[PDB]
Amino acid sequence: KMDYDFKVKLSSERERVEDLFEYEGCKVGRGTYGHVYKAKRKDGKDDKDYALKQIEGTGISMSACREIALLRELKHPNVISLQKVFLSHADRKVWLLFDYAEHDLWHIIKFHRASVQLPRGMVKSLLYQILDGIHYLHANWVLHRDLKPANILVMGEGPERGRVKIADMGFVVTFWYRAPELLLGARHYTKAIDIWAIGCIFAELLTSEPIFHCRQENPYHHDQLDRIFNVMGFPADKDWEDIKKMPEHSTLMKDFRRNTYTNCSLIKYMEKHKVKPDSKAFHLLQKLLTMDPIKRITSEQAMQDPYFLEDPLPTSDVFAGCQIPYPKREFLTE
Amino acid sequence: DKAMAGNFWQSSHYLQWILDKQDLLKERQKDLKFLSEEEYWKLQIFFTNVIQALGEHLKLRQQVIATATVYFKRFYARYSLKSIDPVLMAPTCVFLASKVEEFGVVSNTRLIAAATSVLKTRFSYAFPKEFPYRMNHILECEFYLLELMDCCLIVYHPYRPLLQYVQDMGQEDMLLPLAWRIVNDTYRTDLCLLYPPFMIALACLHVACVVQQKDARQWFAELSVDMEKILEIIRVILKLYEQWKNFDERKEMATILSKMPKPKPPPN
Numbered sequence A: 001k002m003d004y005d006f007k008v009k010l011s012s013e014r015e016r017v018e019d020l021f022e023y024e025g026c027k028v029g030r031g032t033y034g035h036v037y038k039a040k041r042k043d044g045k046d047d048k049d050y051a052l053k054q055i056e057g058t059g060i061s062m063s064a065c066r067e068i069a070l071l072r073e074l075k076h077p078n079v080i081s082l083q084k085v086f087l088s089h090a091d092r093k094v095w096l097l098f099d100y101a102e103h104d105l106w107h108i109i110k111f112h113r114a115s116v117q118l119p120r121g122m123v124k125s126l127l128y129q130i131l132d133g134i135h136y137l138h139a140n141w142v143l144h145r146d147l148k149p150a151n152i153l154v155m156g157e158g159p160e161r162g163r164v165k166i167a168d169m170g171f172v173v174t175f176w177y178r179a180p181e182l183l184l185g186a187r188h189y190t191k192a193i194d195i196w197a198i199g200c201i202f203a204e205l206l207t208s209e210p211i212f213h214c215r216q217e218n219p220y221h222h223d224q225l226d227r228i229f230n231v232m233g234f235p236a237d238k239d240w241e242d243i244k245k246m247p248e249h250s251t252l253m254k255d256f257r258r259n260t261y262t263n264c265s266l267i268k269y270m271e272k273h274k275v276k277p278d279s280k281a282f283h284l285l286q287k288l289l290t291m292d293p294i295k296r297i298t299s300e301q302a303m304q305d306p307y308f309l310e311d312p313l314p315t316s317d318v319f320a321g322c323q324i325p326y327p328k329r330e331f332l333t334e
Numbered sequence B: 001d002k003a004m005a006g007n008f009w010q011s012s013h014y015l016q017w018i019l020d021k022q023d024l025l026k027e028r029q030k031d032l033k034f035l036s037e038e039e040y041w042k043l044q045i046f047f048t049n050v051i052q053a054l055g056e057h058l059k060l061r062q063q064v065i066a067t068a069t070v071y072f073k074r075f076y077a078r079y080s081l082k083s084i085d086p087v088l089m090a091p092t093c094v095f096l097a098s099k100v101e102e103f104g105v106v107s108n109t110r111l112i113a114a115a116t117s118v119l120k121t122r123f124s125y126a127f128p129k130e131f132p133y134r135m136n137h138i139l140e141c142e143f144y145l146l147e148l149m150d151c152c153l154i155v156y157h158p159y160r161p162l163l164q165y166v167q168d169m170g171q172e173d174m175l176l177p178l179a180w181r182i183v184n185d186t187y188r189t190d191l192c193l194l195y196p197p198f199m200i201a202l203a204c205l206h207v208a209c210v211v212q213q214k215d216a217r218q219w220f221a222e223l224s225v226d227m228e229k230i231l232e233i234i235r236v237i238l239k240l241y242e243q244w245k246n247f248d249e250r251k252e253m254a255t256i257l258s259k260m261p262k263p264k265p266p267p268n
């Protein structure tokens, strides 16, 4: 029982995604969260690109509900922004309109790793903007829970050239950005967990390879911990007193010996990749990559590090007026 | 703490869903051809009670029931009662709010049995016929509800600021129980559409102080707030208890529900 004049009125006024946007054969991302298209407006008021996401599933799932709920409230230059929500009544599909970001750190790092490492002005500007976006989210009690290069988008040409946008693209799963407490069975996500991942991204931006890279092997992941201990060393009791309280601590003790990693340290790792241990960059990295989560600095504290007062200062445009050498997004077809 | 806790002043609640009283009353004139002003507020009370009982049967926290109650009000603030049957809208609001507040998806059999079981046992004086809607009607109605609300799902309520104010007073054990029920009672009115949650909280705390005869004049005077707006809210709360006294819900509601404007069906 629904009034007819009400139904037809809304149906008449309702904007359908297919009527407003051109997107057939322009798919740029596919994954666990659904499909992403590069879209143009049919009624040509602008020639700007748009990211158009079709949510995987139908109706209003917990995933759709959570995405809509949050992004409808969030507003920050360094966080990806939702423009419109389209509810298709025919098929019960949910479409989301976002800003189109041409680049991201996954593709940017891969480009430089194919050589020419990343410019140092660019690394500082990237880290500052990432820290700025996460500080805003953490201030609003929003945790990311999956920070990695693929989720750090960067805008291409246009009015926001080179601005970082934090996103959550989904999924091909790696534990390279997962803090040790999660690997030892920590039950809950935390602000600290996000910071560790930012520390991993910063190490990767400096050296071009993932700091805790691991071959493809429950919460306990032995090989991923072994890699962290090869780089960082095995933690002393003094360095992390509450490691005992971790559910997997007894398994850690069964499988590992501290002796094994006696000549391992973050200093020794970063020296091999030509990053000086007395640089302000390294001293910042060390504070992000601290094993004990209560001994990691916060995003606000990281933003105030003297690193960002050293020459050169970070820029809004991460590319700093230089020609963007990185290629545009190729379309998918399946 | 909860997501977006300290963001009310940049929130969609504040920027879009704090309405002007005169626009609310202008849009209401459609329904006032059929119902009187009195009968219209009696319906507001009735459906507030229905959503409370649905929430209790499903064993959801008061925060979820409040969010669902706000969704319902927001809907009929803009549209007529004839547009969608409020017997369908009420359980749809609980279903949606339960997702937003992250308690989960209530199952199909469980939501429909709740609607059915609540109308039969707790509202048979108003509803002789059994709950006629199945889950496909809920899923459809959920799409219409999400559109009108402009996908504004996060809602701030007075319970959080009230709890902070009574802690500052250091009178948590004395005043909180009564002030809490008065905040529940405000959802029988339009106040959540017209005033920010912290202002409603102060007004409820004020009435609790008067009722329990605890002097807080100096505490209230020390606040930097528009005290004239707090008095507006108090008058509505005091008026609400006189409405309550004189309203026999169980004798009147069957006649009032039948006076609601009826949907136009398709031509066929």
Ligand SMILES: Cc1ccc(-n2nc(C(C)(C)C)cc2NC(=O)NCCCCCO)cc1
Pocket: A033, A036, A051, A053, A062, A063, A064, A066, A067, A070, A071, A074, A079, A080, A098, A099, A100, A101, A142, A143, A144, A153, A166, A167, A168, A169
């Ligand atoms: C289920 C779900 C999935 C994703 C999100 N979620 N969460 C965020 C943060 C604000 C936390 C960064 C961004 C998103 N979603 C997205 O960023 N979706 C894709 C944006 C496409 C832009 C391409 O130019 C939220 C909920």
